[PDB]
Design a protein around this ligand. Structure first.
Ligand SMILES: [Zn+2]
Ligand SMILES: [Zn+2]
Lengths: 114, 85, 138, 144, 97, 222
RNA sequence: ACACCCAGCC
């Protein structure tokens, strides 16, 4: 996890290890730049449902005329008594017909599931 | 290019009413019923304005203009803005 | 203090004819260049054409410093305009129209893979190993 | 268009005049903090390692054109012409419409990655908003 | 019979046989646009609070909304709803749109 | 000191300039002033926690434009200069970006309509004729180009047959000038009848077959 | 002829 580039030729960094010190080095495979890593991560894969749609919905979705509105689920932060609820329709799950709610107040848009 | 250099430019398109040329060569307005009966084609002449210029090493440019040069006939949809109806 | 409620109003001036041309310049945010090191520069037209309709090619500090290449802006200033307010001792702004927008990009100086030897090594479509050894032979 | 076999996308991007991968991924990827798309585009960069500069990328494009030929400059010119006048003509035909084409190709790859991740639905050939109707006007214009 | 044929194509009028579904008929109020030049739209958008592609860092695209005209990415805009309301007002008032 | 050197005094002074985007009408008005010296004024006010910027148009020029500031850290905007002496200098760096918008909302759309009307003046669309055109293909005794060509042909006349020695002298000048030749160009240079040229060339010259373009004559006697 | 439409009945 975490992608960043070298400052010399601005190409993709790659992991590498040295035998003298035994420390991870994110070195540029193109140029001759090296740097010390700070996470000890290379390849994180997520097989089950870790999409975290709560942080993926754009808060401006509330002002879409085609979405339903409800008053039984008030906003937690600003306390507005109107919200817009919708489902996900994303692949890799094809299930979990759950509702994601977005507050319709301007200068707001806290997303919450329930 | 052959020394002279000839340049032709097509600028303006004109398009008259549908017309028919009989054996005499006399143009007359083609009425759509007449086209249906006599198996004609309901088409209007298409005229274009052309500018011809010649470039010579002696700087003797001409700007001659062939106005409304006939370049064929376009079939005309009935009851459109360019029909007789 | 005076800076909290500073009041400033200077007169704008637009000359008609100016013997020297202007152009907008903008590096990329990630270039991270320095201007003190730019002791010498050479801004000449590229030789790849073989004049006014060709790109430039910046060469900084000869072969020691970095080189840059760029292109004119695709858009045209038919509706938009760019003016620069140059500071002067008398304080009157002098708005100056520009002629072109330029964007040079960084280029790295190192032994580069050639097209012919690239074709030669293309046989190793995915069988290639030891990426350092690719450049070591050359 | 006018190339008889597939080309990796990073080669096309490099041919458009963007060498450093930072510039490539600043067009394909708009949000830095999104590891999934970065991981999904890793293979595209890994395949394009051997191609390192604009002119060699142009050679890559041109070597697989209509004619192999003999010399280099001719198919460098051929690749430049096919990327300037035949690849996405609707965004740019002029000589220096390269940044716009780069952004559009980046948007295309971004849409592909979004579809792969499942963040968008694949489009339908029938959503009748994706179909245009050539009437007498456009058809007669096509002949004329 | 796709869902998007509502009001544009008759759901009933098709031939039966080898051409079923492929040959359709316009709805009774369907109108097909003859097209228009996208120039005035582009001039208005540039005059409005829109920033062109070449004048922006790539980092700003993520938060802003993209503007496509006739399928061509023209630039980006930071306030989408204001632009949408203004454009709809112009179209409804038979202005340049 | 060199022709291609870029002067960087402006950068060392950290001079900050303003980049302002203005519509077409303001720029056209400023251009119409013919560089009189002044075209307007700019008013910048600073409150306890906000900054207001505006441009006041000169009353003489006409016979209030609020300004909006954008982010600066997205790109590094600078400006350079090129002069007639091929001397490159850097004026400075842009420190703030400005956007100019018209205060008017509804009435300014009328000016937009006028601008669109002006922009649609030179675009051309086909016209319609009430009567069929009959001025073309007008009868004529002969075409102008044809009579011109006959006049030229009768002023110049036919190329006159000459004695063998003088045509041979042109041939000698010819293969002194260039080793190889094409039959047409030789005819043009010598200005001699084609059958007579062939007769006087076959005696001394021979035809060499080539696999590149066509067989051709050789002016060398051997 | 040939070709292309349209149409009928399953
Ligand atoms: Zn590197
Ligand atoms: Zn809320």
């Amino acid at each position: 996890v975490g992608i960043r580039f070298c400052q010399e030729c601005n190409n993709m960094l790659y992991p590498k290890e040295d035998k003298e010190n035994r420390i991870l080095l994110y070195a540029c495979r193109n140029c001759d730049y090296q740097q010390e890593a700070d996470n000890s991560c290379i390849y994180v894969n997520k097989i089950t449902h870790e999409v975290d749609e709560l942080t993926q919905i754009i808060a401006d979705v509330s002002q879409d005329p085609t979405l339903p509105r409800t008053e039984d689920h008030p906003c937690q932060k600003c306390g507005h008594k109107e919200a817009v609820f919708f489902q996900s329709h994303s692949a890799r799950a094809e299930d979990a017909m759950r509702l994601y709610y977005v507050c319709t107040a301007p200068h707001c848009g806290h997303r919450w599931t329930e | 290019q052959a020394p002279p250099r000839y340049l032709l430019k097509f600028e303006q398109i004109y398009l008259s009413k549908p017309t028919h040329w009989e054996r005499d060569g006399a143009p007359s307005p083609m009425m759509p019923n007449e086209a249906r009966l006599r198996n004609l084609t309901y088409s209007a002449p298409l005229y274009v304005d052309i500018t011809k210029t010649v470039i010579k090493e002696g700087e003797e440019q001409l700007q001659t203009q062939h106005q409304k040069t006939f370049i064929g006939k376009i079939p005309i949809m009935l009851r459109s803005t360019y029909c007789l109806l | 203090g005076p800076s909290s409620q500073n009041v400033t109003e200077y007169v704008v001036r637009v000359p008609k004819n100016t013997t020297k041309k202007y152009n907008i310049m903008a590096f990329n945010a990630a270039d991270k260049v320095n201007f003190a090191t730019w002791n010498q520069a050479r801004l000449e037209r590229d030789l790849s054409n073989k004049p006014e309709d060709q790109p430039w090619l910046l060469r900084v500090n000869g072969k020691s410093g970095r080189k840059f290449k760029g292109i004119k802006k695709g858009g045209v200033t038919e509706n938009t305009s760019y003016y620069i307010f140059t500071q002067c001792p008398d304080g009157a702004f002098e708005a100056f129209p520009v002629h072109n927008w330029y964007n040079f990009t960084p280029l790295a100086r190192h032994r580069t893979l050639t097209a012919e030897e690239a074709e030669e090594e293309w046989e190793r479509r995915n069988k290639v190993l030891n990426h350092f050894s690719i450049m070591q032979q050359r | 268009p006018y190339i008889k076999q597939e080309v990796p996308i990073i080669i096309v991007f490099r041919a458009l005049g963007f060498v450093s991968d930072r510039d490539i991924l600043e067009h394909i990827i708009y949000d830095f903090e999104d590891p999934e798309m970065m991981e999904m585009v890793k293979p595209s960069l890994d395949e394009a390692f051997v191609i390192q500069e604009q002119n060699v990328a142009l050679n890559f494009i041109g070597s697989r054109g209509a004619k192999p030929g003999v010399t280099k400059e001719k198919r460098i010119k051929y690749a430049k012409e096919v990327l300037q006048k035949e690849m996405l003509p609707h965004v740019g035909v002029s000589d220096f419409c390269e940044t716009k084409k780069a952004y559009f190709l980046g948007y295309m790859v971004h849409r592909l990655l979004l579809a792969a991740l499942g963040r968008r639905e694949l489009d339908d050939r029938d959503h009748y908003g994706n179909k245009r109707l050539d009437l007498a006007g456009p058809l007669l214009a096509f002949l004329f | 019979l796709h869902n998007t044929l509502w009001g544009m194509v008759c759901p009933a009028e098709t031939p039966e046989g080898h051409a079923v579904g492929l040959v359709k008929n316009l709805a009774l109020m369907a109108y097909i646009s003859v097209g228009s030049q996208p120039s005035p739209i582009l001039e208005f958008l540039e005059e409005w609070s829109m920033e062109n592609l070449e004048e922006i860092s790539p980092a700003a695209i993520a938060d802003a909304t993209k503007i496509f005209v006739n399928g061509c990415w023209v630039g980006i805009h930071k306030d989408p709803e204001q632009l949408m309301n203004t454009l709809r007002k112009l179209r409804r008032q038979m202005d340049i749109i | 000191a060199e022709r291609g050197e870029l002067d960087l005094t402006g950068a060392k002074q950290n001079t900050g300039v303003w980049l302002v985007k203005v519509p077409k009408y303001l720029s056209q008005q400023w251009a119409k002033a013919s560089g009189r010296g002044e075209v307007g004024k700019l008013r910048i006010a600073k409150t306890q926690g906000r900054t207001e910027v505006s441009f006041t148009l000169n009353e003489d020029l006409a016979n209030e434009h609020p300004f909006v500031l954008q982010s600066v850290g997205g790109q590094t905007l600078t400006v350079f200069t090129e002069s007639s002496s091929d001397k490159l200098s850097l004026e400075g760096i842009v420190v703030q970006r400005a956007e100019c918008r018209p205060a008017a909302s509804e009435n300014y759309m009328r000016l937009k309509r006028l601008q669109i009307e002006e922009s649609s003046k030179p675009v051309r669309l086909s016209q319609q004729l009430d009567k069929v055109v009959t001025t073309n293909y007008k009868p004529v005794a002969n075409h102008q180009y044809n009579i011109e060509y006959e006049r030229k042909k009768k002023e110049d006349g036919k190329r006159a047959r000459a004695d063998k020695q003088h045509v041979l002298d042109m041939l000698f000048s010819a293969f002194e000038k260039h080793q190889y030749y094409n039959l047409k160009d030789l005819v043009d240079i010598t200005k001699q009848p084609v059958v007579y040229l062939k007769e006087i060339l076959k005696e001394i010259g021979v035809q060499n077959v080539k696999g590149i373009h066509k067989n051709t004559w050789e002016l060398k006697p051997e």
